[PDB]
Amino acid sequence: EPVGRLHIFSGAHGPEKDFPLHLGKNVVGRMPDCSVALPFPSISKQHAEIEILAWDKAPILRDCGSLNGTQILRPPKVLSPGVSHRLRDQELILFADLLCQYHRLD
Amino acid sequence: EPVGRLHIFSGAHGPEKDFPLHLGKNVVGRMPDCSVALPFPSISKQHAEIEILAWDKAPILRDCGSLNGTQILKVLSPVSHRLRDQELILFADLLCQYHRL
Secondary structure: OOOEEEEEOOEOOEOOEEEEEOOEEEEEEOOOOOOEEOOOOOOOOOOEEEEEOOOOOOOEEEEOOOOOOEEEEOOEEEOOOOOOEEOOOOOEEEEOOEEEEEEEOO | OOOEEEEEOOEOOEOOEEEEEOOEEEEEEOOOOOOEEOOOOOOOOOOEEEEEOOOOOOOEEEEOOOOOOEEEOOEEOOOOEEOOOOOEEEEOOEEEEEEEO
């Protein structure tokens, strides 16, 4: 039933984990209510949003005004708050210092 | 036999892959004759070098005057950068991670 997966690689925070992604707004943040809950001090309560709409295959990543930022690698830059970045399958992203990878599902 | 490793994250180009690093000079480049052969159009024939002197000493990464560059997540100039464990490296647009063993 999910349309994507976000994989968080193992690091200082702990072991690897996967998070299902659904159509609509997938909020990344430290809060337990978040679609992608990352309860780590470097992560803001509402850190970022991955919006997946049925009418476009590419998710839209936006930073939500986080302290430590959201970084993409195509090209390497910290995202300006609110500006859309369109994600490609298998794209790697950093939330603060946490490395993640987006996967499109069949 | 190997003293470190470089992990290349999955993409369109294929699954995740690990490359062993050995004592001495480990050349990273496009050609199959490189210690770390990364056959991507964006990577130079001789792209970068990871020199490992001892098991217990931090490797030195040097860019070899490649076209698309090498970055630490700090842009590396044709500079001797000392690698930390779990350091993320971009060779051109290709992300990879250095690991101690």
